[PDB]
Amino acid sequence: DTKEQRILRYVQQNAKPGDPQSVLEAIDTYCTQKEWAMNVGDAKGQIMDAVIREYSPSLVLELGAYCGYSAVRMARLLQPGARLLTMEINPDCAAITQQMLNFAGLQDKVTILNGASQDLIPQLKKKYDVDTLDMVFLDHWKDRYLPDTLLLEKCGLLRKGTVLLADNVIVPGTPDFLAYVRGSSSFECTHYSSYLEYMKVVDGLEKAIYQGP
Ligand SMILES: Nc1ncnc2c1ncn2[C@@H]1O[C@H](CSCC[C@H](N)C(=O)O)[C@@H](O)[C@H]1O
Numbered sequence: 290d291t292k293e294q295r296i297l298r299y300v301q302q303n304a305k306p307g308d309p310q311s312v313l314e315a316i317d318t319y320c321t322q323k324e325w326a327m328n329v330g331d332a333k334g335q336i337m338d339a340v341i342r343e344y345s346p347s348l349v350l351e352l353g354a355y356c357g358y359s360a361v362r363m364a365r366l367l368q369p370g371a372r373l374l375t376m377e378i379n380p381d382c383a384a385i386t387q388q389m390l391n392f393a394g395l396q397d398k399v400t401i402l403n404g405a406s407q408d409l410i411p412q413l414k415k416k417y418d419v420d421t422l423d424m425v426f427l428d429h430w431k432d433r434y435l436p437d438t439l440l441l442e443k444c445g446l447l448r449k450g451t452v453l454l455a456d457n458v459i460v461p462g463t464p465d466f467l468a469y470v471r472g473s474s475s476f477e478c479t480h481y482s483s484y485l486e487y488m489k490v491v492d493g494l495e496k497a498i499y500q501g502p
């Protein structure tokens with residue numbers, strides 16, 4: 290039995306089926322009262338909400354699903370017809386995420402892709418008929434942010450206006466990623482400060498808006 294299963298079980302026992310809000314609230318309650326887990330969380334969730342509302346992406350890509358907290362957070366604000374693709378390398382996490390989406394009633398707006406981002410990204414065009422992305426949420430292994438971003442660039446999946454939203458750019462930290470996007474005229478960056486309450490340390494998100502090549 291694992292932490293992630295315990296989270297899922299707490300939700301099935303306490304949340305209301307078909308109700309994404311109550312699912313979020315239960316995950317936050319559990320991970321705040323019983324055992325911490327690396328969900329983006331409610332504070333950073335507020336920033337993610339504002340971003341989705343401002344840009345109204347029709348096609349979103351998430352890197353790193355874990356227990357589905359962030360997938361549920363975003364999918365619940367998507368407009369009719371909009372969709373979320375989420376890539377998860379670990380099949381145990383994809384399973385928990387799938388069940389979390391099922392319980393929330395969001396399964397028709399979200400598609401889980403099983404694999405490593407770098408394996409799946411070059412397949413997006415021809416296998417999943419993607420033209421370009423409207424938004425990408427990066428929240429997988431920190432060493433992957435930069436190479437995957439350059440890979441997204443090279444496969445031609447970004448367009449002028451595409452919103453990159455990167456979590457944990459301070460802790461554990463993604464210095465090479467930040468240096469690249471902040472350094473580059475191809476991206477316009479904003480930093481959103483946020484505090485990780487359990488670890489009592491300042492973190493943040495970076496919003497990088499692509500300008501084209
Ligand atoms: N290269 C990669 N491709 C796909 N998934 C990856 C990956 N590297 C790490 N992961 C997955 O990314 C997750 C990071 S935690 C993701 C948290 C989630 N976004 C939330 O806030 O709810 C883990 O489940 C891990 O298995």
Ligand SMILES: Oc1cc(Br)cc2cc(Cl)cnc12
Pocket residue numbers: 327328329353428429430431456457460461
């Ligand atoms: O939000 C987070 C906090 C900490 Br600490 C570690 C994380 C690791 C991953 Cl892979 C994704 N998110 C994380």
Ligand SMILES: [Mg+2]
Pocket residue numbers: 327328329428456457
């Ligand atoms: Mg994170």
Ligand code: NA
Pocket residue numbers: 470471472473474475476477478
């Ligand atoms: Na910049």
